[model samples]
Target chain A: PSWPQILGRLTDNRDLARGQAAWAMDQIMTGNARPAQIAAFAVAMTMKAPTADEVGELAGVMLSHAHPLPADTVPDDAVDVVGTGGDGVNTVNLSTMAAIVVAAAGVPVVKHGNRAASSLSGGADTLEALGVRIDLGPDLVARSLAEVGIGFCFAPRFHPSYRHAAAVRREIGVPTVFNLLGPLTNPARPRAGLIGCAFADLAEVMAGVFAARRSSVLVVHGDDGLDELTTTTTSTIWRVAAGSVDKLTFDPAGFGFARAQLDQLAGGDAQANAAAVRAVLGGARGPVRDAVVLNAAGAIVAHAGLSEWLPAWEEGLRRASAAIDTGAAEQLLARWVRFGRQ
Target chain B: PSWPQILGRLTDNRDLARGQAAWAMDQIMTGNARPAQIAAFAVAMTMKAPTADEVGELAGVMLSHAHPLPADTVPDDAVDVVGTGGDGVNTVNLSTMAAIVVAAAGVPVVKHGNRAASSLSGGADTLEALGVRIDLGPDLVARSLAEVGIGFCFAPRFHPSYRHAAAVRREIGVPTVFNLLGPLTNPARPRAGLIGCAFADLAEVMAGVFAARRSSVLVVHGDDGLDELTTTTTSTIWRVAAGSVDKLTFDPAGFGFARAQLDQLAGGDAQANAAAVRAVLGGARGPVRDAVVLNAAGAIVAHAGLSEWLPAWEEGLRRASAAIDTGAAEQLLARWVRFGRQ
Candidate 1:
């Protein structure tokens, strides 16, 4: 459809149909769209967020343009734990830290992330501070997964079209749909995934995007406004697999874990968060460690395609705790850091 | 307020505050805002149209930068009759023809108008096709009104800032608030005005805009989809004066006139419409002549501020008919054409 037609539909408060959303994303991803067109699309989408089907349609476009990942190199047991990341909580990098624990607990993992946009430190930011070279090409990223059970898919390096849009995003200087596109376009196409969202309203959109690609994934958001699965309060999770979206909620008290205050998870810049990651994997015990363990268990359960939430969650928690106590999580991180630098 | 703030408010489905609309129009009128910002503003506003006060605020800013007509040249008894012309009707120039009749009956008229946007022949288009030189500077335009009792306020020449936004409007290729701004910003600021609107839903915004500017005006729309008041069906008209909007309806039968078919009023290109206008002023007696007289009466009632619709309407009709019968309306048009060429 033409720009005028798409804009007319949007202005009339209607969501784009499947092919229409595909056309819209093509314009956006190709960098051929005028800044005026991009700005208009961004503003119109923000008026009322897109639907699950609409978001899935755009994500299909993003994945279509993604850098190719060799099938044999992609581990079937691998999972990516990530988030849409607009949760205003300045928490430590829970998902990035948990990727290490989950990897050590026996699920190979790819950490797809960008540097901080709305956060003090994003996954790529902390990983870089922890001595991992996040600027590596996808080939090196795959080798890191092969050798160390973990890899970081720095978004800008992997998504060429997405890189073209960074200037306009900053020029507009407002949050837009582009911010949520990263997590849904994992280059490696992990078999199982965990995505944490800031807004509960967006859970359907996120899970539905995953389901569109016919994959097992869990999209979670905490009531405390953490995009991560939190020990601080109840966290809502949507499991998307086999063309279905299953809703579930997790309460800390249900699992005999003490509630942690949100302030307890507060983090600083990349350097500060990197130190916290090392401390958690290096056997430090407290609210932060429990937070990391809880999230890692969530990722592990998603990777294993476990159906019973409580039983699966409890088993994965024990596994993540054992991996940290045995120092395997710290060793796995050190291995990925060594491979990433090479 | 900045562009982002205003765009933010619009994107969130909220109307701009009093001063914010002023800021927005300033940016557009001055051509200082980026193309992206302009497109975003246009699209977001189109999503859920702006409020009456918002439009008024912008028009106030438009008039602030409008080419000034020296106070001594401005006429207090003048009325401008126009419309926000998206009716999609290919009709004869009734308003322009009626202006000559209204002026012939002794109420001076400054017909503010554009060429053709969504019509076969707009006021300027029809007047130009007739012997009138529609592209005069303000001084000559004032002289024409002084010499002939009627003058055309060709919008492009009168609205300098509006000329700057023409490119963006075409580039975006969609309907926006700018389309309606022309009818409200007669550079002469005529004391009494009549505006025909295509959309009935927009009557409040139209009347409220005139009310905000503290003017006596009638905003009219016909149920048959003609922007002009029509004899084919009842017309809803709003009187905006004394800080309130008063609603009134007009049906042909109520005033002892037979309803005319809309097809009888249909027009063609500029030449065809111009011929129709000349025939209507040249003592032609039929639906076309009655249509012209009926709308002229509506304008007259508005200009006179008459409270009794039927009585004032009947009086204006008799006066308009006499002007046509006595050949004053034709002589008035011939005089304007002569002066317009000079």
Candidate 2:
């Protein structure tokens, strides 16, 4: 395609047609585009905030180009929890802990993630630091999910094609669409998911992209710019289902919790974050554990559909905390440890 | 500087501070920035439309880094006429012809330009095609101006430091600030200029950039998207003087010219445009000639100051056409030919 024509349209603050975005993303992932061109595409799309349908189209290209997991390896109704980790907050892996808790609450979970790009720690980085062997083949990953109720599908393993753009993305210092597209292009293609976005403005677009897949999702962003449903300040959630989106402004107090400060929710590198994950699953008290439940609860609502959050967010909270308080999350963590080691 | 901090500010739709734009552009023109980072900077700035002061700062960096023309080579009152050349209109070299006519009208003229990057034929390309040596050093370019009333400072020979960004700019496909900065960074550092912009929205910012230099310039755009004061339709001009700016919307009929269709001013490759330049100086008739005078008169107005166009647009027009009327432009062309060859 004409890079100038496409880029010119966007820099002029115009939107690209669905096909234009698809072909541009195709060029990007296939190594057909130059590094500078990919950077322009990334920056231009970010400037446009990339309309939902266009980003959805972009994600579909990744889905088509990715190495797919074998069908039936995981349950048809399994849920995934992931975040686009450009928040720069260096928080513990809330989504990762939430995934384990959600799976413990009896929802099948496959967590898709990458190592830290613009943050101090990411889910895959923390999980590996937690001594979980994350690079599982399809059968083993599915076995882990079926037996222990959760699995981790590290992004680089499923989307090896991203190698073409990895260097440019790393060099740019700013997060491009490829950052958020990580969560959107999960290979397992889980039936439902809770996706956390760092930038609040992108929540609707994220939800709409999921809806474009005819998949339900809860796209959440914390007031503090954390990429999760936090007990700190307020959070906004966009619920996507049946080709439409609805929004909700959530207060942690509604679920009988006090707001926490950002420092209380913070973690350092993978070693520090990995320790918090273990502590939380081991019945840790305080804001960190509460924050994990808040996120896992949101994923439960996404799995149960939009009706689940209409007014009963507390039910989602209660179901999630039980996974940790009753020792289910701790037991599940032990189960995955044995399965992942094999 | 962190590329993301600067790029993030822009893509997030916030303007960069004067120092931020200065540092980002410094990184760009130097070899410190990667091709992808440069591309991102280009795209992000375009998305933000780059404020006048910021763009002015970017231009100042170029002027400081560029190879300077000996101050005495081009006179203090010399005027320049150049366009940003991303209009995609492929029109005749109206500005090139206007430069010769402006010089004939007794203004010292130093036309700074480049060979085509994204255009059908650039001013330098047309001049070279016309067998006028464009790669003149300071003294000879000075000699050509002194002896013949016209001279050209080819951009590459002056701004070799642009080697860092040239390939990235070419590869990106969209016109970035570098396109407009070329007109602002003339090695001659001409006292006044008519800087034609292809996009109307940027006229004020362009004017402010020139104003930042304490320069007087008329930044113009044709209603039909030509980067010159065209006879095709209404034109908008931003008058920059005394560190402030004012704007005027111009009609061709005000100067006693009928509106010409864009196709009437259309041109092709360097050979085609070069022939048109020769014909215009040789007293060829029609829209091309009218456009040349229109732009030349605007440059004359720019040279004489904003007061010159307040009511004497016709006087400027009269003096410009008289250059061709008296056969002075054709004679000046002949004089430069002998000097250039020497």
Candidate 3:
């Protein structure tokens, strides 16, 4: 493929400029971008959109260089939960508590998450706010899964070779191809993923991407401009499974749910969102609880590889309520805090 | 024109996977490129082909910043001369001697040129070797014309801002679009010009460029390879005058002379070429003498607005012979030498 030469040509066309940028981000995520090659590649990729081949190459490189993790460490019914994050949405951490709800039902959750970039509160921040330890080492993560069925992989600790790229991204002072690379690069390389995207287009592209990798991925975007679902907002989803892509749409009503007010999901900031997540898991029923259950149902559906989400919806809500009631999620939170000194 | 945005697009494309690498050269010639912007623009253009508008815009900027000489300052019967020069020819200073020979024949000459860049010697070096102080101020250039009918404007000294471009060009380490800009940027802004190009396609483009600037320009390239006329080589010419462009071809035979061997016309080096100019002015009969006469005839035709070359050709030979007879060309040399000693 004359990889270096091919990489150079991909940077040349401005018409396809954005795709090229995407390819570079993919490389950075996978630990495939070398320090010596990063600046020129970053600059060029910023100029052009990364081609599909470039994206594939980057994905392959990441898989090769990715720090190994124990395979299927989470429960058989595990959901790999994450978001692309550049949706320009200021929202609460619905996925964080939703993972708790699923974990409560004895379903494992391998959550690959990060600090807030575009939103008010990301999963890691909510986890931190919950007195949950943020930096569970890989071994600790495995142990956490064996014990409580919930584990979090903070992106920074998992991908340490990306320092130069991170530095340049800050220096450039703008969103680059790196933003798109983060969600797909979970160290866990989970078999099933629940990814929130900024646009439905990303869902389509990423679904194709995951299908190529033979992973079951439900790529989603809220039509109301949120990366993750906020109850009441319509969302589009492309589910990739068994090398096939299926598109679908949903709302709370699909699960005999009441319509949620957009404002009930208010995010004063990440801390405020974390507070909301804590309240919902602690059994406070309102827009926040409704939103988490609605989102939890989607995640569980993806994890169970179901044809539709309705069958698992009630189970998801029950599991989340039990995790908080039985204090399993709270116990896991304590272990995280003890391990990471939160 | 979307000029600023296109500049950005080009810059971005250069950074993109498929951007052109030749863009830096284009930006340099056009003067639209700023010293501050060079680093980014340089890197981009290398990855992408610069648009024609970019080239035109940069040329516009160069013209604005350069120290422009008044056209009225040129002698009424004078012709202008220069070369784009990055042929990597490494030959003698053909254009410089051709100017002197034309001057010797009573055709006033405004020689706007630079030192060797991609050649062993250029117009500046040849003039320097002929005992002419190349960095003469405007007053001295006029004096040289009054005394010997020829004036040499050393480009760097006349175009002060060009100093800023020098380091960048050196650091860039390649001939770029700017290389073509050099000949078009005559400080004298002469009324009639002899522009030599390194490449074949540039013949028409540069001729049109000068015409757009309203110059009475003659663009030429040796079909055998020298940008100027070669003794045994046929050459093509584009004469832009009276708001029209005309293509023509000729050889030494057109000057009432016989074709000579290629080696006879070889300048060997700038110094050797400079010496040959001195020998011709001293009335020696040889290959260099005959070649100078042919080039001088072409200049005479342009300067005199003659319809054909034979009459102007004979006149150039006679006047060149007279400069030698009266010892004025030699005396001008002494004045230059004495001034240098001072």
Candidate 4:
């Protein structure tokens, strides 16, 4: 429980940053370190910039302490669509909407999230406003995923051990290693994912983490600092598989989407953002709809294998646009809400 | 209070490291940050390796909250001799004994210190074993400095605001920013000082801090890693006066002292260390005596100002040796103990 010793190990660069970072996280989660100590530890990692392997190990430690989805109930090809939010753009829940579209496009989705930390409305807030229940336990979360194709596992429910860290993080009040960790710790342990990071190098670092676990993952950082693949500008993307990682540029223009302004996607309270989400799924026109479609296309590519990345997302773009036009995405949301209430 | 925002300021690398570091220290000292948060803040600074100005600002904040020696009671030419201990050499209390010699050699001394944090015994521990009371209030400490020409200000009594930080530091269990701040916060706010750092670059950094405050100071680091002006190895030295900082190498050989082994000065428990200090001040000769004389010479030069590097220490070394030979240093220690008991 000598958190500072572990910090010394990390700072000394004597190797084992991965294990040391994990050990430090264990101490913070188990309440071994004081709030101030945890804050210092967290801030130190942010300043030192945890390597992908270090972050990967921290995620593993968090997962080890989490209420994981029962193996018997989890879908083998389950996918998670999440963003390490803190972009400060305060846009509508594009990733959440994409998760639903991805599910409707035939991929199982375990969308994990929390209430707004910095933004006016987060994925969970928008989901609640959209009539979807989010406080379900692991068993129920798996059931919803099995029955409705897409389920929301609110972050706090699965990672209850994080209460200690959560409290410290709130008091410390800035995006820390925990912010990046949240999206990486989906209780379902989804086999594939689309994760948006705040910075481009972070996208590569996250990919390296996923690469360690042999998970098929795509990490993206929009040029404008949005936490999701944005139609407004090209995004830096990393494709991580079992043993390798690849970096690429993602331009929405290649998918036949016109360049849009990030401001055009600005959202308000939960209700307002929820309405915007509904409109996007209901086949509304303009930038909001375009953003949702592009993100969904990326999620589709992420969920499937590399084959779908060709025509370089042309197939994904077609599938996502078809889901909206055919009302399947909207229908999935309705069914998700029904399953949550049931 | 907006600690995360301040952390962001530090992480962003957008300049203002000094102000942000100071603001974070203020937050911890004032109990605005939780225990875990404070530990994190402290560890973060250690990892980032704070700039001299950043540390200086942090030191300024700590001093502002300290129970400073009253201006009317403190000597105008007071000097402090202290070290940021973490060398792990377990050497005898060289600096503590040198402080006594420095006082007997005609300079007022304000020796600020703590109980052993890592080693078997520390300055306050040895002083206590030697019959000097250490928990005096500010007025008494100042009075001792004024009346006895030397006083020991135990860290906790003067820096009460450090309680929260101290707890976190112990829990964190490593050298932190607070370690360096302790000596800099000597409540007497002496006009000149001899400060020893565990690392060479740190000596230069500390000198920069003193430079900004226009304090006459000497910072030393043993090439052997001891946080003292070791006669065992060439020491890196930084001289700070008014607005300038000068870096130099210190070779005790030039002062007619042999290169002694650090182990030759190894110490034991508080009583053992106290006896060693007494023996050295009582004119006993050997490696311990040589170590004390070198540090004492450095203190004298630091306190009295150096006209030239070579002949500068010659006079100080001679005076320090005379003080011990004349029984003057031992008499000073006896008088200091009496004042503390009174």
Candidate 5:
């Protein structure tokens, strides 16, 4: 099939966005398209702005072609917390910290992540900096989740099938479907997630995609335009679950948190962001720690099947705060590293 | 300076489209951007649907970096008649035939053209089959315009600077800025033109670009979707002139021509299209002939400085028909090839 057929279909606002986008992605992944053609396809899709369903279709293709984690090893209750990077905000890896907190609160997390694409620090970078092993194979990763309550699957290791697109993505130097696909194609295929998007429009569309797939997902977009649920402003939330979806204009203050400026969340290199996460886990109290608690609370509330806004917020916040205050979050990180070392 | 910055700007729909587009074109031409980056840039702009001013800015860059035809060789009264191909109609190079007719009607025509990008036969290809020399140097091309009243600047020979974008455009296999740039960046920089576009929206925008550049240009889009002036349907015309622009919904019937089906003007390969053009130029009356006369009328009127629509139509048609009926257009092509051979 001609690339123009795909591109022309996309530009015409025709109905084959899903079909053509999938075809383009397939070609990119299979290394079937030239470097220029791959770049053109990426740019074309970005210009066409794929629909949620179209994006979802591409994500499904990515997953089907990915090196799957042993299906038998992943637990049904596992959840993933991630963000579609490229928000260009140098925030402390909030989702990474929240995964630890959520795990400390007794829920399993298979945190799928990668090094930074647009930020000073990424989830895998911070995890590696904090002494967590990220190159573990499928079985070890699954064991880490089962034994340590949190597992980190470095993106490159799990999605090696997408190696074909890596160079083009790097060369193109712009956000494409792969940016969003990363979060959606977690190798463990967790049924629940806490995902963050840089733009609210994307958050809304992704929510629809997740809901249609019948997965429980909370898609958040920072009111300050950060991909993380920033404390700087109210974040818009789209909660998707089987048979229902709800939109919530959330103010962190309602969950007993104080408003903090975005500068307060600014992160640096892996070491610096790692230190911030350690400080929070070690019971340090500040905007950074509170932000982590807020995100963790949301993740725990979803994981624990706590329904309704007020009750879930109150209980989840209590659990997250207690995990830090009691030192369980810090202890979990240590145990995670120690278990990997052993 | 970063391509991502430019892509981000285009995607955001902020101002500076022309600046960034020009920058991207420069990088693409100079081999500065990676293949993926080039493709992404191309895709990103297509997604944005460049404004007339943005398209004009890029055209300026293309012209500035182009292998210029010597300024000394060009006549002040020269005009270029061409089309932004990709209409996919595969018609018998009507604009090429019209250029000859316009030239025979006593206007110096420096027609800038190329081999096929979308159709089976492009202007240069059809002209070549009709025994016209296309590989002449800038000096010879200029002499042709001066002495023989018509010159064909085969695109590849005149714009070697655009070699960088050529591969990607071919690899992507779709119409892009380069397609539009071809007509707009005519090396001779003629003061008058008859330009056809595949889409009316583009024709509308290009009119502004041409007008702001202070050229006398008539941008036309066939209601039947052919890039050429077709007798099959009405056309939307944007006549741009010094400090003024007129929008007209033109019905060919108003010019005393009966409606003809597009099949009547359908073209084949280089040989077939050349034969059809020869038949029309040799005074065979049909849709192919009528289309050529209609477009020739446009070029002649634009070159003769006949501003008002009604008066321009009357005199332009009379001259265009006389050029073919009296065999002056055929004689001009013969003279054009003879001069190039010498």
Candidate 6:
């Protein structure tokens, strides 16, 4: 079935597209999608955006085809905040720290993330820099999320089958669609999530996709073109739950913080970006610090079901400040350090 | 040689992007890009549109490393017009007949095309139906172009490295960057060409790309979203010669023809699409016929330095009409039919 030949048949049947994508993903992530097939896949998808159904099914395929450690579902109010990371803007690991702040605010957080891709410090890298053994088995992740407010999932460990893709990814040295599939394949299939997308259309489509999976979710993209709803700039959000979707736009002004300069959010490398997350956790007061706090605040408020975003934002900022002041977030991270023991 | 690590490097270096792309293109088209690498390649390129320098260098790598055919530069006046495919429109084999029309119009054509990919019938397929042997040695190709003014390079024969990619493409059964590379890899490396692309950006990028290689060329895409400049739609054109680039849009009205219906241009399968090409060669004289005439005319205008398109258009139409009227296209096609025979 020369794909060139099958592509004609694929367009007619939606199921065929899903099967092809699934098969393709298995090869790429597992370091199997060859250099030639890799070029072909990138060119094909670029010409046409994958449909929501196709994306979700592809995500499901990833989950089915790979072996991530099994874990029973955690309680309600647990969430994972991840991004389809390709905005090209180097922002701090806001979501990783936010997971802590949100968890400290009394919500369970299993923050699944990768080491790094286009961004300087991926969530796991940021967590790892602070001495948290970022790689833990599924059982350990479930336990950590249960005991502490947050847990981190280093992606490669979860999808053991991604070995070939890891090698291929190393050789090709560029982001592929597999980068986005991570946010969709949370091992536990967490019910609540704050999914950030690099592209605007992806934010909207991903929200509906999560809704189809019956997830309580908030998908976002910063106007400055970052995946997260950075306090440094205006950002759009799509709220999805049960079977409905709603849209909203936001800025730092609502959180009682001045807009931060883009340079203040510079994350040119993991060391710098990790330092920023550490500064935020340590409660340093400044633009980068405030922006981080405010981002953490957004995740906290979004999941808490507050009446409006601003007031909940205020509460999130207050809680984040408290986590920094009290060292609860740091202590939680310390627990993760001993738990991951990788 | 894992691509994830390669992407890791590419995130910082712009030069590596081309290397990565070349590696990916070779893998995808040749069945060498591993699944993991495919995923990485797909994500990286989509995140950043491939640069012209990158595309050119990658094309160079493809020709040298993967499919190195011997150098034979066809005349800049004898254009080889081919689409990259992947338009997903399944239009008739207009270009094949168009080549015949151009050839009959006192100009030569070295049409390098492959077997059916996503389209119902590709150039090679239609030519086969018209009694042309799909594949032959380089000498045969050169002889065919020299004698008949139209030569079809049945891709695999000239680009043997593509066999590996063909296998992967067959297994994956979806489109990839290989489709885009087909038109770029003119086995004879013609100095002038007419490329049909679906995306507007590719028109400029690919044209500049060819210009960078010092080729006189035009990249075209129909406004009705078809790859070929169909008679029913406005077609965007990007022209490049020496060091200059220009953009133009034209309709069939300029050629004194009515806009065609989409259904009239619909090519469901190879046989159906091939039949349409046969009709054009057989002088069917409808929208499909007009469409091929228009395309052939554009090739003539682009190649011949003709001042106005209408004369070239009428000249092409008249020649195509004569080819069928006098059985020239048919007779040439009949030679390809018995190519391997004693």
Per-residue CA lDDT of model 3 for A214-268, tens digit only, reads 7777788877866676566677788788878888786766556676666667676
lDDT on C-alpha atoms for all candidate structures: 0.82, 0.84, 0.64, 0.82, 0.81, 0.67
Query: Cα RMSDs of all predictions?
Result: 2.8, 2.6, 8.2, 2.2, 2.3, 8.4
- Residue ranges of candidate 6 with Cα displaced over 4 Å: A1-6, A9-47, A65-73, A162-178, A268-278, A306-311, A338-342, B1-342
**Superposition TM-score, candidate 5 onto the true structure:** 0.94
- Model 5 DockQ reads 0.70
Where is model 1 chain A poorest over a 10-residue stretch in terms of lDDT?
A: A163-172
Reference contact recovery of candidate 1: 0.60
Find the candidate with the highest DockQ and give its number: 2
Show the lowest summed lDDT stretch of 10 residues, model 3 chain B.
B14-23
DockQ for all models, in order?
0.55, 0.77, 0.13, 0.64, 0.70, 0.18
Tens digits of per-residue lDDT, candidate 2, A1-342, equal 578888888887788865999898889888899999899988888887679878888888898988777777877778889988888888888999999899999999988988887678888888888778788866677778877888888888888887888888888877777767877988889868989898777778888888877787888898888889988889888888887889988888976898798999888989999889989988878999989998898888888873345554677788898988899988888888888776
Interface RMSD of every candidate? 1.8, 1.0, 7.3, 2.3, 1.5, 7.5
User: Which candidate do you rate higher for TM-score, 2 or 6?
Assistant: 2
List the candidates' TM-scores in order: 0.92, 0.93, 0.62, 0.95, 0.94, 0.60
lDDT of 5 at A41: 65
When 2 and 3 are scored with DockQ, the better candidate is 2
User: Per-residue lDDT of B1-342 in model 6, one digit per residue for the tens?
Assistant: 445555555433334533556665655655656554554444344334556776675567657743333355354456788887777777777777777777766677777788776677777876666556777777777667766666667778877766655565555555434446777777777767668887665667777778787776778988887778777778888877665778888777865789888888777566666667666666566887777767777777667542254675577566656766676765666655565452
Clashes in each model (backbone N, CA, C under 3 Å)?
A: 0, 0, 39, 18, 0, 71
Q: Model 1, range B1-342, lDDT digits (tens) per residue?
A: 787677768766787876888888898888887777777777777666878888888788889988766657757778888888878877888888888899999888988888888787888888888888888878877887888888787788888777667766766666676666877888888868778888787777878988877788889898888888888989888888777899888787887778888899898999999899888888978888988898888779878872266688789999999989999999998888878655
lDDT of 2 by residue, B1-342 (tens): 588789878877898875898898788777889898888888888878788878888878878788777666778888899988889878888888999999988988999988877678888888888888999888788878888888898988888777878888888877777677878888888879888998777777788878877787888998888889978789888888877788888888865798888889888999999889889988888889999898888888888873335555676788888999899998888777777787
DockQ of 3: 0.13
TM-scores of chain A across the candidates, in order, are: 0.96, 0.95, 0.82, 0.95, 0.95, 0.85
Docking class of 4: medium
What candidate 1 gets wrong by more than 4 Å, as runs, is: A163-179, B256-263
